[PDB]
Curated annotation (Swiss-Prot), chain A:
Source organism of the structure: Escherichia coli (strain K12)
Protein name: Large ribosomal subunit protein bL27
Sequence similarity: Belongs to the bacterial ribosomal protein bL27 family.
One Pfam family this sequence matches: Ribosomal_L27
Alphabetical UniProt keywords: Ribonucleoprotein, Ribosomal protein, RNA-binding, rRNA-binding, tRNA-binding
GO molecular function terms attached to this record: ribosome binding; rRNA binding; structural constituent of ribosome; tRNA binding
GO biological process terms, semicolon-separated: assembly of large subunit precursor of preribosome; cytoplasmic translation; cytosolic ribosome assembly; positive regulation of ribosome biogenesis; regulation of cell growth; ribosomal large subunit assembly
Keyword Kinase: no
Regions annotated as coiled coil: none
InterPro entries, per the entry: Ribosomal_bL27, Ribosomal_bL27_CS
Subunit structure: Part of the 50S ribosomal subunit. Cross-links to the 23S rRNA. Cross-links to the A and P site tRNAs.
Cellular component annotations (GO), alphabetically ordered: cytoplasm; cytosolic large ribosomal subunit
Annotated NCBIfam families: L27
Swiss-Prot record, chain B:
More info: This protein is located near the guanosine triphosphatase center of the 50S subunit.
UniProt xrefs under InterPro entries: Ribo_uL30_ferredoxin-like_sf, Ribosomal_uL30_bac-type, Ribosomal_uL30_CS, Ribosomal_uL30_ferredoxin-like
Transmembrane segments: none
Gene: rpmD
Family stated for the protein in its record: Belongs to the universal ribosomal protein uL30 family.
GO biological process: cytoplasmic translation; ribosomal large subunit assembly
Protein name stated in the entry: Large ribosomal subunit protein uL30
Native organism: Escherichia coli (strain K12)
MF terms in GO: structural constituent of ribosome
Gene3D superfamilies the UniProt entry points to: Ribosomal protein L30, ferredoxin-like fold domain (3.30.1390.20)
Cellular component terms (Gene Ontology): cytoplasm; cytosolic large ribosomal subunit
Length: 75, 58
RNA sequence: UGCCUGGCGGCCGUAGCGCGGUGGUCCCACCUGACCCCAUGCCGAACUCAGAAGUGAAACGCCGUAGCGCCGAUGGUAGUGUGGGGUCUCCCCAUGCGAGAGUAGGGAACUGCCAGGCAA
RNA sequence: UCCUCCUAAAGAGUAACGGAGGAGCACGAAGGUUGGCUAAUCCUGGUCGGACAUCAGGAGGUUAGUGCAAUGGCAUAAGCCAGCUUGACUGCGAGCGUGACGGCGCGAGCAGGUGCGAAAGCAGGUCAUAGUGAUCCGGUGGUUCUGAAUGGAAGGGCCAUCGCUCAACGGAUAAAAGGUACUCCGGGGAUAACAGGCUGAUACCGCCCAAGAGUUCAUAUCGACGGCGGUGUUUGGCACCU
RNA sequence: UGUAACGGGGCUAAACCAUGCACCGAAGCUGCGGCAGCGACGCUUAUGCGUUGUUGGGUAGGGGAGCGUUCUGUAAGCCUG
RNA sequence: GGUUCUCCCCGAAAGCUAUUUAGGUAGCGCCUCGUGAAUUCAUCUCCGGGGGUAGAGCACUGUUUCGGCAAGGGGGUCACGACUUACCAACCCGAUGCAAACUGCGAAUACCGGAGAAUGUUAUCACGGGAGACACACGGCGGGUGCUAACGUCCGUCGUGAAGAGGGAAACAACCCAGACCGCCAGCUAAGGUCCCAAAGUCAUGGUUAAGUGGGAAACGAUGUGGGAAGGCCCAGAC
RNA sequence: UUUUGUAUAAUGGGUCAGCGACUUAUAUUCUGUAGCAAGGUUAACCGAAUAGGGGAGCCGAAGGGAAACCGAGUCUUAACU
């Protein structure tokens, strides 16, 4: 009675650390918030992370819970 | 840096695409073909990639 | 410049817990009252206002202690890219990369700005 | 048809009549904002009350909860409570993700007009991921856009919206079940039935260990619980040949 | 069905392990001769190249360039008892 | 089913999505010709990245073996006090394992981005004309399914065949070596070979094998034979 | 020939000679070539006629919008950073 499946949602990181992006570009597609928005990064209703400014994207770990953050520096 | 010489000693028929690209990037075309290059860490890495099918002498 | 104290950070368990000691000159906390401001799905509990008697008990800060958490080598091992081999449902050789766990050990923090008291 | 996990080999994607489960909603609040709050499970005391109602304290730090299956996420809480509210708003939209395409998704910012807050600010539905159906034809409201001599109107167009478990869910018609051994044609060893081939689960045969039976004594003769092989003699698997 | 589980003869090394030096071995590579495609440069400029480097297995299929046959004009011209 | 002359250049696919669709067809991927373009692209080095696979582990979700402490439960001495136990046992502690749908850890590769040298006939991208193809097969590696059966079946990645002759494995598309423009009674090599068939060592040195092992096959059995590390008893004399 | 794959024991052919399969008409798009060029070109028909007349018409130089309408702008919107 098996045989059912769902179409893959093509999640994952779209832009990796150290590459320039344009404002509004999608950086990470995720179900929850595995990565939290940092500086110049906005979070969508579906927890999508997009660039709010033009620059280089970088990843880092911050906070007491060592949770991962994505930031953008104007470079 | 210095003078380095490389020769191909094996065929490149049943080889992976990366190996074929490395031979193409080294200039080797046919077995026994001797190529002339310059010592360089990038060049040394290319030889190490396909060291099994090339012979290098300085 | 130093012992201190409060706030805002960096950094985030070598920074966190347990046990013992230590602090009231200021600051902090507890603390008295609350008719009025404010609130209890009841309560000055909590929040808020009027105070400073008393106190360092609790909480908080600092010191000590490894009793835990935590960090952690070197070496070896597992795995593995490429090229070869075997008694080929698993392994070995040359080369490259190289864990996890564990062991020796480390460890009971460090640091920037502002404000206030004491001694200088 | 759609959603979640695994298979899936640390980007994405990835098949099987492979292994597990769900959806065809719900909510004017379960939405927006402002303010406040922080569980499960245990231990002790206490009327009914009892392992398990409610109260007080302690350990605990999220094993709780999150409207609905699963995964990811959630203390700044996305979890729980209350006040005021309708941003579940209109016209757009730089720039991206995802698809062969139709299409689907995210989105800063600008204009207009609103809600919450002293304010910075937040709000273009809901923690996210399922809750859905193209086009045609036709219905309802608005709009002189058009309106075939002229002025109107009818009918069209534009805008808003309504009618399909069209579930065989990219939907061949608005509308459709059977028999043929009386059969026919075009093809296929792309695909079955006999035989061959590969395989050896099963079958048959042989061997290893040895509990026990055999008057006592495992091995004269049988030999359970288990194990290792050979043959292609049965029943099977595959569909390579015709 | 017939040796029939080294291809055979046959082998006690003509087997296996370790090391070494030789040789054989392809349409691979090199040498010599010839043809064609492509890109450069010295020069020809509608074309050869004193040259240079490289390429030339091929089905479905795409591109380029040609041979030959019947008939029309050139042509009552030309060849032919 | 058949499709008739020649030469030169390049050269596929048997995939995805949809389909009353599965042996058809359409778009895309792949091929070809033309046009226009940026150190466009590939390999290597260095740098910046996020993974949760192999491995490992058992904090968590499950499962598993042993030992202890053992609340609690039964039988028993008690006079609303209260107690013992040869007997059942929770939660925890110590040790040992297992997991595709477990992760307090975590590679190698692969993938994305940036810089740099060399190399490559722009190998890259965009647009236009024309296609074919959408039955794949075997081999290696990672798997699902099956019996860790099948020249079985279904995926991922590379190779070969398809569409590649030649040499080797006796013969043997898919295995190993190697990519055929033509000619030569020239040379050197690869895999594999060198006693004869049959081109080349009856080559050299040190060992093993007695079985025709080599030149099919296991559990298991045995004074076969070679080597190594030891150990007990031994001319107060061992077997 | 068909196929993943054929000496295949898969298909077809006894042989020879002759015949036997991508054509034709009208439209549309692209490439090459020739003429003319912001212009290009005629159809039917007339024509002692492959000439010359015939410019009806078609394509192009201007687009945007469903349309009215506007116009190097236009549509969208009350209006655009």
């Amino acid at each position: 009675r098996n045989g059912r499946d769902s179409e893959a949602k093509r999640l994952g990181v779209k832009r990796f650390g150290g590459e320039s992006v344009l404002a509004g570009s999608i950086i990470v597609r995720q179900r929850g918030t595995k990565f939290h928005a940092g500086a110049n990064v906005g979070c969508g209703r579906d927890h999508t992370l997009f660039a709010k400014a033009d620059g280089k994207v970088k990843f880092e770990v911050k906070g007491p819970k060592n949770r991962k953050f994505i930031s953008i520096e104007a470079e | 840096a210095k003078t380095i010489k490389i020769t191909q000693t094996r065929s490149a028929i049943g080889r992976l695409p990366k190996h074929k690209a490395t031979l193409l990037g080294l200039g080797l075309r046919r077995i026994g073909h001797t190529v002339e290059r310059e010592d360089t860490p990038a060049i040394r890495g290319m030889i190490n990639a396909v060291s099994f099918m090339v012979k290098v002498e300085e």
